């Protein structure tokens, strides 16, 4: 194991990616809040930051509705032979009545 190299731990590589996304999101929320709160900023960039704040507070609602529609879309394509490949339908071994019906078909012709 000592002669073997060391490896990048993926389980912490994902966590400081999602956490960095959340930190950048919180910094952008606290940055588009300050751009409208002061009065020295121009109105062309005072209302634009307001709608950018509206669009940033509306993010997990968008995730909720987006998730909902995609869950229904995934339920459209569950067909019980994808998820259940060992489905037993029906079978019937050959009875004596089949051979009797065949012999009757050859006798009455």
């Amino acid at each position: 194991p000592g002669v073997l190299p060391v490896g990048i731990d993926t389980h912490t590589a994902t966590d400081i990616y999602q956490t960095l996304i959340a930190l950048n999101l919180d910094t952008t929320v606290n940055d588009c809040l300050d751009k409208l709160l002061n009065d020295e900023c121009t109105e062309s960039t005072r209302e634009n930051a307001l709608y950018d704040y509206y669009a940033l507070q509306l993010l997990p609602l968008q995730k909720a509705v987006r998730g909902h529609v995609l869950q229904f879309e995934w339920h459209q394509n569950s067909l019980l032979t994808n998820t259940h490949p060992n489905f037993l339908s029906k079978i019937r071994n050959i009875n004596v009545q089949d051979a009797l019906l065949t012999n009757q078909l050859y006798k009455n012709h």
Binding site: H11, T12, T14, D15
Partner: protein, 51 residues
């Protein structure tokens, strides 16, 4: 995200679906005793045209 959390997630997922199957069985035995209970899925139709 390690193994000891990834199996504890699966224990806090199977125990949900076992209670869900208990609910599914009770809502079947309710309608088999001629009591109109709701299921996991919604009630299908109404008296309109289809039964």
């Amino acid at each position: 995200f390690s193994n000891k959390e990834y199996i504890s997630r699966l224990w806090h997922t199977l125990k949900y679906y076992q209670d869900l199957k208990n609910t599914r069985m009770k809502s079947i035995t309710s309608t088999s005793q001629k009591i109109p209970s709701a299921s996991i899925w919604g009630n299908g139709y109404s008296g309109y045209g289809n039964g």
